[PDB]
Design a protein around this motif. Structure first.
Motif, PDB file in Angstrom:
ATOM      1  N   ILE A   1     -39.610 -25.763  31.674  1.00 55.94           N
ATOM      2  CA  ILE A   1     -41.018 -25.936  31.982  1.00 55.94           C
ATOM      3  C   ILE A   1     -41.505 -27.190  31.275  1.00 55.94           C
ATOM      4  O   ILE A   1     -40.960 -27.605  30.251  1.00 55.94           O
ATOM      5  CB  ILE A   1     -41.858 -24.729  31.533  1.00 55.94           C
ATOM      6  CG1 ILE A   1     -41.142 -23.423  31.888  1.00 55.94           C
ATOM      7  CG2 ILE A   1     -43.237 -24.800  32.168  1.00 55.94           C
ATOM      8  CD1 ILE A   1     -41.908 -22.184  31.502  1.00 55.94           C
ATOM      9  N   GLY A   2     -42.560 -27.780  31.821  1.00 57.59           N
ATOM     10  CA  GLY A   2     -43.261 -28.828  31.123  1.00 57.59           C
ATOM     11  C   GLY A   2     -44.097 -28.215  30.020  1.00 57.59           C
ATOM     12  O   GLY A   2     -43.736 -27.182  29.447  1.00 57.59           O
ATOM     13  N   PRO A   3     -45.219 -28.834  29.690  1.00 58.97           N
ATOM     14  CA  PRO A   3     -46.190 -28.194  28.803  1.00 58.97           C
ATOM     15  C   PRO A   3     -47.024 -27.189  29.588  1.00 58.97           C
ATOM     16  O   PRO A   3     -46.802 -26.951  30.772  1.00 58.97           O
ATOM     17  CB  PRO A   3     -47.039 -29.362  28.286  1.00 58.97           C
ATOM     18  CG  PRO A   3     -46.398 -30.615  28.812  1.00 58.97           C
ATOM     19  CD  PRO A   3     -45.592 -30.221  29.997  1.00 58.97           C
ATOM     20  N   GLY A   4     -47.988 -26.597  28.911  1.00 61.94           N
ATOM     21  CA  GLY A   4     -48.868 -25.628  29.533  1.00 61.94           C
ATOM     22  C   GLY A   4     -50.155 -25.456  28.763  1.00 61.94           C
ATOM     23  O   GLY A   4     -50.576 -26.343  28.016  1.00 61.94           O
ATOM     24  N   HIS A   5     -50.784 -24.299  28.949  1.00 58.10           N
ATOM     25  CA  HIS A   5     -52.070 -23.996  28.346  1.00 58.10           C
ATOM     26  C   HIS A   5     -52.012 -22.631  27.680  1.00 58.10           C
ATOM     27  O   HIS A   5     -51.290 -21.736  28.124  1.00 58.10           O
ATOM     28  CB  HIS A   5     -53.183 -24.015  29.394  1.00 58.10           C
ATOM     29  CG  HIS A   5     -53.399 -25.358  30.014  1.00 58.10           C
ATOM     30  ND1 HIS A   5     -53.182 -26.536  29.336  1.00 58.10           N
ATOM     31  CD2 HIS A   5     -53.807 -25.710  31.257  1.00 58.10           C
ATOM     32  CE1 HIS A   5     -53.452 -27.556  30.130  1.00 58.10           C
ATOM     33  NE2 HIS A   5     -53.833 -27.083  31.302  1.00 58.10           N
ATOM     34  N   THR A   6     -52.781 -22.479  26.607  1.00 64.39           N
ATOM     35  CA  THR A   6     -52.821 -21.235  25.853  1.00 64.39           C
ATOM     36  C   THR A   6     -53.776 -20.258  26.524  1.00 64.39           C
ATOM     37  O   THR A   6     -54.925 -20.606  26.819  1.00 64.39           O
ATOM     38  CB  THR A   6     -53.256 -21.491  24.415  1.00 64.39           C
ATOM     39  OG1 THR A   6     -54.467 -22.260  24.407  1.00 64.39           O
ATOM     40  CG2 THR A   6     -52.176 -22.248  23.659  1.00 64.39           C
ATOM     41  N   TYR A   7     -53.302 -19.039  26.758  1.00 60.54           N
ATOM     42  CA  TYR A   7     -54.078 -17.990  27.397  1.00 60.54           C
ATOM     43  C   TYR A   7     -54.107 -16.757  26.503  1.00 60.54           C
ATOM     44  O   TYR A   7     -53.291 -16.605  25.592  1.00 60.54           O
ATOM     45  CB  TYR A   7     -53.491 -17.616  28.766  1.00 60.54           C
ATOM     46  CG  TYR A   7     -53.645 -18.666  29.843  1.00 60.54           C
ATOM     47  CD1 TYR A   7     -54.489 -19.754  29.680  1.00 60.54           C
ATOM     48  CD2 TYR A   7     -52.938 -18.567  31.030  1.00 60.54           C
ATOM     49  CE1 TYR A   7     -54.625 -20.708  30.669  1.00 60.54           C
ATOM     50  CE2 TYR A   7     -53.067 -19.514  32.022  1.00 60.54           C
ATOM     51  CZ  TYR A   7     -53.909 -20.580  31.839  1.00 60.54           C
ATOM     52  OH  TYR A   7     -54.037 -21.524  32.828  1.00 60.54           O
ATOM     53  N   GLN A   8     -55.063 -15.875  26.778  1.00 59.87           N
ATOM     54  CA  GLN A   8     -55.214 -14.613  26.071  1.00 59.87           C
ATOM     55  C   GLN A   8     -54.965 -13.457  27.033  1.00 59.87           C
ATOM     56  O   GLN A   8     -54.612 -13.652  28.198  1.00 59.87           O
ATOM     57  CB  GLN A   8     -56.605 -14.510  25.443  1.00 59.87           C
ATOM     58  CG  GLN A   8     -57.737 -14.573  26.443  1.00 59.87           C
ATOM     59  CD  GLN A   8     -59.089 -14.370  25.797  1.00 59.87           C
ATOM     60  OE1 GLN A   8     -59.251 -13.513  24.929  1.00 59.87           O
ATOM     61  NE2 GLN A   8     -60.070 -15.158  26.216  1.00 59.87           N
ATOM     62  N   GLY A   9     -55.156 -12.243  26.534  1.00 57.97           N
ATOM     63  CA  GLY A   9     -54.935 -11.030  27.307  1.00 57.97           C
ATOM     64  C   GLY A   9     -56.242 -10.294  27.547  1.00 57.97           C
ATOM     65  O   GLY A   9     -57.097 -10.225  26.663  1.00 57.97           O
ATOM     66  N   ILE A  10     -56.382  -9.745  28.751  1.00 53.97           N
ATOM     67  CA  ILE A  10     -57.552  -8.967  29.137  1.00 53.97           C
ATOM     68  C   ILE A  10     -57.080  -7.765  29.937  1.00 53.97           C
ATOM     69  O   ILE A  10     -56.086  -7.831  30.665  1.00 53.97           O
ATOM     70  CB  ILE A  10     -58.562  -9.805  29.950  1.00 53.97           C
ATOM     71  CG1 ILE A  10     -57.892 -10.415  31.180  1.00 53.97           C
ATOM     72  CG2 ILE A  10     -59.152 -10.902  29.084  1.00 53.97           C
ATOM     73  CD1 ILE A  10     -58.203  -9.689  32.462  1.00 53.97           C
ATOM     74  N   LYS A  11     -57.801  -6.652  29.797  1.00 55.63           N
ATOM     75  CA  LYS A  11     -57.428  -5.396  30.428  1.00 55.63           C
ATOM     76  C   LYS A  11     -58.614  -4.813  31.179  1.00 55.63           C
ATOM     77  O   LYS A  11     -59.775  -5.078  30.857  1.00 55.63           O
ATOM     78  CB  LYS A  11     -56.916  -4.379  29.399  1.00 55.63           C
ATOM     79  CG  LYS A  11     -57.858  -4.150  28.229  1.00 55.63           C
ATOM     80  CD  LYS A  11     -57.523  -2.858  27.501  1.00 55.63           C
ATOM     81  CE  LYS A  11     -58.522  -2.556  26.393  1.00 55.63           C
ATOM     82  NZ  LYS A  11     -58.771  -3.732  25.514  1.00 55.63           N
ATOM     83  N   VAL A  12     -58.301  -4.014  32.199  1.00 55.04           N
ATOM     84  CA  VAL A  12     -59.334  -3.333  32.967  1.00 55.04           C
ATOM     85  C   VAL A  12     -60.116  -2.409  32.044  1.00 55.04           C
ATOM     86  O   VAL A  12     -59.542  -1.701  31.208  1.00 55.04           O
ATOM     87  CB  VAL A  12     -58.722  -2.544  34.137  1.00 55.04           C
ATOM     88  CG1 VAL A  12     -59.814  -2.079  35.086  1.00 55.04           C
ATOM     89  CG2 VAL A  12     -57.686  -3.378  34.883  1.00 55.04           C
TER      90      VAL A  12
END
Lengths: 98, 87, 384, 335, 103, 49, 49
Positions: free
Chosen positions: G6-17
């Motif tokens: 993979i190249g670079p990317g972006h930081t993500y978080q977690g979310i739940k219903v």
């Protein structure tokens, strides 16, 4: 008639077994294309591509020298340029299986 | 045993000598003269030529078989054709 | 182009080096058995041992490789042919035909009598099969199984008169010697047999791990399935001989006492006089190389392998690992050419394989051998 | 004449066979003409690799990891063992994401991706000049933190359903009646929004299906393993090298299949009432080598068969003796 | 069948038998004995996913993931196998040796 | 037809058996003849039959 | 392809219903605050070998 001619010429090979280019026009195929022998590829090692300068990008750094005093403190230096490109860690690369 | 050992054939070869065809009066050197030998040439131990022919035949068959199947042959398990036939 | 060349050298030389040159990667556990496939695979060999610059510009077999069975290779044409012949899967049924050999060299014939003929076969996988790597196939999980063996025989006519005529008408030793590890001398004593029939003897060097202890039903210590030169004539350690001396007892000449193997034209002449695939002059190959002089070049410093850096920064360091290091001028090798060439000396060596030595013609001998790191055996073929 | 043996015993390491021959009246028996005929079954062991290099994901970079997850213990007075990080890709384009999952086809009652196979890993957006803009919902499927981490190179996961899916069947489905357990595909749905997103308006941004597969590496191994703990962050960079080729087969001239020169196990060609072993099978003579030299000597007559020697062991002459003349690398080669 | 081989040989260059006859044999996954077999259709087989154009000579697309095709016929997790056989004969003809009806 | 097609064996592809192998661009004779005529679209020919 | 596939990317978080039926999403605590997840295909460069 044409097939008769073809078989006749083939039969005449007996006398003309010396001409090694006797049959330089007859249709043929690459034997390996029709029947395929897959024994893999000797790809034990990787094959990297490195940037043109041997390094990726980096960060600008300055120069600092040990203080003439015994103090364990560091001061800005004037005998070194304000900005120096010095990469940190290994270099960016991308590998391809040739 | 009944095996024709080197030692026996050599003894037979050494003992034999044809009294005739040995000209003791002058230098003749047979195979330089254009004349036939005094006596027919015969082997030392073996006499009958039929048996020698049979032994030659068995030896030739032995050799040809060894050439035909010396390596051993792989033949298809399901069918019965030879996988490495040699003509 | 550099990558293709390095890949070829790696896959065809580096992986087949002796185990002393490899290492076990950290954080991985490999079996304790040194002859199993998992062990022979897990070990990783540094890619810099045989690099693109190895002996640049000359014909020279690698020094480590000389004492490694060249026939245990995956470019072995015959082995690959056979493996294809069986198929391309792990489970395959086989239909085969095999020739009887004892009577192929003895050539026996049977008159009346109603004889009984019983023979035994092998189910030990190591001796019946072969492997490119040579990993103990017994413990790996290979098995063999037979279903039906039938005998085909061919009689021939011959008159009873001829048989009666015949009936009324006519009324090589093998020795293996030990050779401890790192030995150089070997004094042997031949058992006293009939001095006659000494129509020359042969001899070559084998390995204890390769020669099977033939003479039982099953050798539990045979943990190798590669090439058995003791049985198929693929000898390769013939270049490890220095001098062979016979005691003063007189011998018939086709009769010297000591022959020099390598210090020599004398041995070349003797072997030629002793004289196909298994013959001299088809497997003899000399080589010559120029190398850096050791004692004359004043500014010489022998850097050990761990401290030699070439292609630094653009290859895994002492490991097939990703890019690491920094670019910097290399130190190995020394330029033998150019405007700054170093002084040079000449080296010479030869390789002879799939062959044997033949000396023309209580007996005592002494053998000299280049030291080796594993037990070996001195094979003697006293033709009689 | 064919000859079916009289008695056969299949011991642990030997297969004994016994025959009975007939008097040669007016005939004599050419023994060296005899040849056997075997038929059996062969298992070449787990170390049979008749090819070089891997067969699965051959193009993948040798350090690239699958899209996997791992759990960080975060030990302390108040341990937090629910870290559950992820690292991977999302390439299946979609119009919107809801509780059901990624949206693939609208007919409205939009059709949401089937969890068994979709998002098919093969299918990904084919556009570098996309610039779609607006909200770019994306989806994919990653590996759960129970399957061991291995590089993409030489990684296999047997298919479990006709449609190409690879998820295992969960063996646990407790029911409140005693009854019996049931099997369900072990696949879930994890949602991510964005690091800077403010607690007010949090919406799904990347769906990611997560499952377990029977991950295995039939033709590869690991050459660099940073940390011992399975499924760790640093373990994402472990390297893989293909297994070494290993061809197995019979020997040249079926060496070793008989029991020549075996004093313990010999044969006899004696008469039914003679008790004199005509086969002196001792270890003084090495029969197999005699055979090899004999066949070599027989080359004279058989110099016409060019494939006469298609099985004898040989080596590549260039491997044993190496001729290094460099590489014509005058120019560069850019990417 | 060996019978046809014999007939063609008895009927007997470039246009001749035994110069264009070629048998072949391969091991393949067993269909009915391997209990955990599932024949994935070509559109749903993914190998080298993410590092090749998908069903098209198109640029990189997809995500890395373990492959499903083919089934390992070798290794420590080999599957059961069956044997297949076929032959190719070309630039040749059949020759039967010697109102007529045939089928 | 990927790198793994029938790994480790001799086997012609099933689709290919019913395709004329002689209509290939590795056909040595056809290429010989096409070269003999030249390397251009318009060529004059002198022949004997 | 890059070394990590993979190249670079972006930081993500977690979310739940949300446990409530409300069609709203909340920050989750069973997922790390930062997760690297690339979007779309990966960076590459092609060469004619």
């Amino acid at each position: 008639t044409e097939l008769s001619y073809q078989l006749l010429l083939d039969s005449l090979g007996d006398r003309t077994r010396y001409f090694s280019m006797w049959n330089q026009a007859v249709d043929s195929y690459d034997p390996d294309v029709r029947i395929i022998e897959n024994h893999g590829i000797e790809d034990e090692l990787p094959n990297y591509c490195f940037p043109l300068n041997g390094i990726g990008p980096g960060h600008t750094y300055q120069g600092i020298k040990v203080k003439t005093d015994d103090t364990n403190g560091w001061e800005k230096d004037a005998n070194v340029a304000p900005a120096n490109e010095i990469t940190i860690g290994n270099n960016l690369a991308m590998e391809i299986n040739i | 045993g009944l095996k024709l050992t080197p030692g026996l054939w050599t003894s037979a070869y050494l003992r034999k000598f044809v009294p005739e065809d040995y000209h003791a009066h002058e230098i003749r050197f047979y195979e330089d003269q254009s004349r036939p030998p005094n006596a027919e040439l015969t082997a030392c131990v073996i006499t009958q030529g039929h048996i020698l022919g049979q032994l030659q035949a068995i030896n030739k068959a032995r050799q040809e078989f060894l050439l035909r199947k010396g390596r051993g042959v792989y033949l298809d398990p399901q069918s019965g054709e030879e996988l490495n036939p040699i003509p | 182009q550099a990558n293709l060349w390095r890949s070829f050298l790696y896959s065809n030389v580096a992986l087949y080096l002796p185990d002393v040159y490899k290492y076990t990667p950290p954080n991985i556990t490999l079996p304790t058995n040194t002859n199993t496939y998992e062990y022979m695979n897990g070990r990783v060999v540094s890619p810099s041992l045989v690099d693109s610059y190895i002996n640049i510009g000359a014909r020279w077999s690698l020094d480590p490789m000389d004492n490694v069975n060249p026939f245990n290779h995956h470019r072995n044409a015959g082995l690959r042919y056979r493996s294809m012949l069986l198929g391309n899967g792990r489970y395959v049924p086989f239909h085969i035909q095999v020739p009887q050999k004892f009577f192929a060299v003895k050539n026996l014939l049977l008159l009346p009598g109603s004889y009984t003929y019983e023979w035994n076969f092998r189910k030990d996988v190591n001796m019946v099969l072969q492997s490119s790597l040579g990993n103990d196939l017994r413990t790996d999980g290979a098995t063999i199984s037979f279903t039906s063996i039938n005998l085909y025989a061919t009689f021939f006519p011959m008159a009873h008169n001829t048989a009666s005529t015949l009936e009324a008408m006519l009324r090589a030793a093998n020795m293996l010697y030990p050779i401890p590890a790192n030995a150089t001398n070997i004094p042997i004593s031949i058992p006293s047999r009939n001095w006659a029939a000494f129509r020359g003897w042969s001899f070559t060097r084998l390995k204890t791990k390769e020669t099977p202890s033939l003479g039982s039903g099953f050798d539990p210590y045979f943990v190798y399935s590669g090439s058995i030169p003791y049985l198929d004539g693929t000898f390769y350690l013939n270049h490890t001989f220095k001098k062979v001396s016979i005691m003063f007892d007189s011998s018939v000449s086709w009769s010297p006492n000591e022959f020099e193997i390598k210090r020599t034209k004398d041995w070349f002449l003797v072997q030629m006089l002793a004289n196909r695939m298994y013959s001299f002059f088809r497997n003899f190959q000399p080589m010559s190389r120029q190398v850096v002089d050791e004692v004359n070049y004043t500014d010489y410093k022998a850097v050990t392998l761990p401290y030699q850096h070439n292609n630094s920064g653009f290859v895994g360091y002492l490991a097939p690992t990703m890019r690491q290091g920094e670019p910097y001028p290399a130190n190995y090798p020394y330029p033998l050419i150019g405007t700054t060439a170093v002084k040079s000396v000449t080296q010479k060596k030869f390789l002879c394989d799939r062959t044997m030595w033949r000396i023309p013609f209580a007996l005592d001998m002494t053998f000299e051998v280049d030291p080796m790191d594993e037990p070996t055996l001195l094979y003697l073929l006293f033709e009689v | 004449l064919r000859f079916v043996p009289v008695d056969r015993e299949d011991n642990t390491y030997s297969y004994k066979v016994r025959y009975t021959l007939a008097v040669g009246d007016n005939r004599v028996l050419d023994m060296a003409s005899t040849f056997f005929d075997i038929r059996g079954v062969l298992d070449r062991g787990p170390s049979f690799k008749p090819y070089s290099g891997t067969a699965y994901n051959s193009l993948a970079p040798k350090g690239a990891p699958n899209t996997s997850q791992w759990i960080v213990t975060t030990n302390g007075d108040n341990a937090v063992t629910t870290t559950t990080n992820t690292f991977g890709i999302a390439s299946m384009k979609g119009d919107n994401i809801t509780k059901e999952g990624l949206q693939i086809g609208k007919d409205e009652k939009p059709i949401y991706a089937d969890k068994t196979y979709q998002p098919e890993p093969q299918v990904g957006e084919e556009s570098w000049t996309d610039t779609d803009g607006t909200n770019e919902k994306f989806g994919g499927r990653a590996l759960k933190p129970a399957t061991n981490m291995k590089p993409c190179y030489g990684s296999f996961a047997r298919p479990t359903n006709i449609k190409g899916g690879q998820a295992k069947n969960r063996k646990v489905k407790p029911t409140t009646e005693g009854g019996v357990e049931t099997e369900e595909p072990d696949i879930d749905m994890e949602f991510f929004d964005g690091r800077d997103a403010v607690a007010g308006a949090l919406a799904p941004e990347i769906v990611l299906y997560t499952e377990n597969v029977n991950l295995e590496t039939p033709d590869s191994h690991v050459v660099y393993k940073p940390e011992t703990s399975n499924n760790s962050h640093a373990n994402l960079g472990q390297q893989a090298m293909p297994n070494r080729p290993n061809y197995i087969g019979f020997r040249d001239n079926f060496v070793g299949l008989m029991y020549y020169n075996s004093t313990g196990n010999m044969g006899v060609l004696a008469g039914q009432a003679s008790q004199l072993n005509a086969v002196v099978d001792l270890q003084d003579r090495n029969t197999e080598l005699s055979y090899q030299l004999l066949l070599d000597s027989l080359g004279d007559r058989t110099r016409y068969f060019s494939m006469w020697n298609q099985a004898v062991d040989s080596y590549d002459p260039d491997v044993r003796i190496i001729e290094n003349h460099g590489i014509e690398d005058e120019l560069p080669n850019y990417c």
